[PDB]
Design a protein around this nucleic acid. Structure first.
Lengths: 166, 180, 52, 94
RNA sequence: AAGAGCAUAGCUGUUGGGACCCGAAAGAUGGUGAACCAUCUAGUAGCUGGUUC
RNA sequence: AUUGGAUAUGCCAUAUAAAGCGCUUUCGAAGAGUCGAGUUGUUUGCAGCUCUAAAUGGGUGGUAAAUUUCAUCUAA
RNA sequence: UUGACCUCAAAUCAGGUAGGACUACGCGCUGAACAAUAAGCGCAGGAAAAGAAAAUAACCAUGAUUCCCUCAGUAACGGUGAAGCGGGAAAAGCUCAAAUUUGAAAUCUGGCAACAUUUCUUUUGUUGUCCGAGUUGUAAUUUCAA
């Protein structure tokens, strides 16, 4: 496959080729709206490994956020507020300038008939998965609120336990 | 705030009805799955034997059942655990062996015996696994003679100095590499 | 009045068994039965045993 | 294990069985395919400026300054020493 | 140096919870109107008053 | 009155089939502005800011020693 | 002179979907004069969140998460205040990206005609056919336990 070359290229973020392409694309994204639909992801490898498939129901929205709460998280919440009939799967980074952080956000149509019949993604249809980022359940949100497995990561103390026999 | 326990008899009765409902749902098969014999991991508890999560892939390989068949017939499989002392190989092996020996698998598709599952089916009975497969504690020894060679073995000859030898091993090893 | 008043009280299990035995033995003394208020003026025998 | 508690042999004396190697530990192993891909991307993408700066530091035998500067860029000594050794192999390869 | 403690109940004292009851301006949060309102609040009370055969 | 799914039964099915496990003559891809470092805020965690990775590498600890072995796990 | 592909519009075009209320309990952000609290803002379910180790440990080793007892008012910090181990309640495992099928895009939405089925003339599909989506990658196989 041609994907192995893609993230190896994507890792070299200070390369001249990526450095040029970031700026020309950043100049363009500044001149569309702050949020706008994209026909296809600018990094197909990144979206693909984040759960995107090139089939009806999946959709990509590009967005930019002022720098200076995480920039990643604010991207999803604004997209979810915009495309309010969708369940937003994930998000990933693309570009910066001196002032902006650019993100591309993957959303899945919960009511679409192609998504509902695909067992790998039906879990997003179930009602508990609506507006995850308002609840902080996405990849960045789960990491932001410190949830993980380890020693490194309230109302079980302030409560007073009074058993029947004490 | 203030956690009260006035539901304690109620919660106990809920679990009873949970077990009775669960058991009656799957009556033919035992209510409780089997667990391996495992040793607690610390110097305070390492002498004891308790029930672990599942049998490691070494043991199912030795016992002659695949990791797929074991899950179907009620043998839990633990992949994280790895068993290194071949007794832990052993003690879990016949544990699987005797479980298979007392196990009776009802044939699928209208009771024609497939492979070696079983032939009789009227022997359907729901038994406590810890009855047929209780977990025992360590086998302690009793009434062993002689060992007067251990008599001359005057304990601290090992303990006091080997503990000092262990303490000073790093300094000693540094010394040997230094003058070399 | 709060619900978390101490409603239930522990008793040593042996003490509970002690008292149950003492009440059982006390059930075999006709003087104790009469004082408690039972009408055993014509009972054949205390303790009283009927067949299986 | 001398049937005892203490020492740099301590433990309960048993016959350890040689456990097999599990695929999780395979991580870090080189694949000729990915090694080829890394060769391709290195040849086409180029280098960031900071390793560019340090390599003529190796070229003009300015090793100590380059090592210190590489440490400043990345953050750890092992990352720095890993960096300079691979650039040097690039230097002799060129 | 030939172990005396463990558990339960009661009484009394003390420490903390609104803490024997009643009572000070104030402060915060969020509102309404062109100061007011509701919660935090049962506050700070080192005192005043009362405290039952 | 529906329904619980099992039991038996009847009819289609398609079934030129695929999968599990002895072996390997080997190959094993494994998630990047992410990890991390410095810095500022706030309750190690997270966040802004500048830099920015690697493949037996990386995280984490018992050891050592301030580095080391060893153990354990495989993040984004 | 025409046709593709791409970018963007427009429709009182066909089909869908979002708002609002409840908020005891869930998960967030913010946060006071106590308190990671009250108030404020956002968003769910019958439960939610967490969850199949980048976890423990230093042992004869443990083995997803959640909860209870214990650890323990201990470690640690300077009044705050855990966790590993042990016992118990409950137990259930897994799915993608990373390689090809190149002797066949084998995949999928929708329009139309039939066959059905229904908690149900209200539901849910199937077959055929057409069209579009899709090689900037839909299927099959594989997920490190391999």
């Amino acid at each position: 496959g041609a994907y192995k070359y893609l993230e190896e290229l994507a890792k070299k973020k200070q390369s001249d080729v990526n450095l040029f392409l970031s700026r020309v694309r950043a100049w363009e994204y500044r001149q569309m709206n702050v949020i706008h639909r994209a026909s296809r992801p600018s990094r197909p490898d990144k979206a693909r490994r984040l759960g995107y498939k090139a089939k009806q129901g999946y959709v990509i929205y590009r967005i930019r956020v002022r720098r200076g709460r995480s920039a990643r998280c604010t991207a999803e919440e604004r997209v979810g507020r915009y495309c309010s009939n969708l369940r937003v799967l994930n998000s990933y980074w693309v570009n910066q300038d001196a002032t902006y952080k650019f993100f591309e956000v993957i959303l899945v149509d919960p009511s679409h008939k192609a998504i509902r019949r695909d067992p790998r993604i039906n879990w997003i249809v179930n009602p508990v998965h609506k507006h995850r980022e308002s609840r902080g359940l996405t990849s960045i949100g789960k990491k932001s609120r410190g949830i993980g497995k380890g020693h490194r990561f309230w109302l079980r103390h302030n409560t007073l336990s009074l058993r029947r026999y004490r | 705030y203030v956690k009260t326990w006035f539901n304690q008899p109620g919660r106990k009765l809920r679990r009873r009805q949970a077990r009775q409902t669960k058991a009656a749902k799957i009556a033919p098969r035992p209510v409780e799955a089997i667990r391996p014999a495992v040793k607690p991991p610390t110097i305070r508890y390492n002498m004891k034997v308790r029930a672990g999560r599942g049998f490691t892939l070494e043991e199912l390989k030795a016992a002659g059942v695949s990791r797929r068949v074991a899950s179907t017939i009620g043998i839990p499989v633990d992949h994280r655990r790895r068993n290194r002392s071949e007794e832990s190989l052993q003690r879990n092996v016949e544990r699987i062996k005797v479980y298979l020996a007392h196990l009776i698998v009802f044939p699928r598709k209208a009771g024609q015996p497939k492979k070696g599952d079983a032939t009789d089916v009227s022997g359907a009975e729901q038994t406590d696994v810890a009855a047929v497969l209780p977990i025992t504690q360590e086998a302690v020894e009793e009434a062993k003679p002689i060992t007067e060679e251990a008599k001359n073995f005057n304990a601290f000859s090992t303990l006091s100095n080997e503990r000092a030898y262990a303490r000073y091993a790093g300094a000693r090893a540094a010394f040997q590499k230094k003058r070399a | 009045t709060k619900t978390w008043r101490k409603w239930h009280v522990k008793v040593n299990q042996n003490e509970k068994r002690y008292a149950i035995a003492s009440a059982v033995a006390a059930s075999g003394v006709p003087s104790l039965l009469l004082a408690r208020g039972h009408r055993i003026e014509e009972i054949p025998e205390v303790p009283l045993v009927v067949d299986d | 294990a001398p049937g005892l508690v203490v020492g740099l042999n301590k433990g309960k004396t048993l016959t350890k069985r040689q456990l097999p190697e599990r695929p999780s530990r395979r991580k870090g192993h080189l694949s000729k395919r990915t090694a080829f891909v890394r060769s391709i991307v290195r040849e086409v993408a180029g280098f960031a400026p900071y390793e560019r700066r340090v390599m003529e530091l190796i070229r003009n035998s300015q090793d100590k300054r380059a090592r210190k500067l590489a440490k400043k860029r990345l953050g750890t000594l092992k990352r720095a020493k890993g960096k300079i050794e691979e650039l040097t192999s690039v230097i002799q390869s060129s």
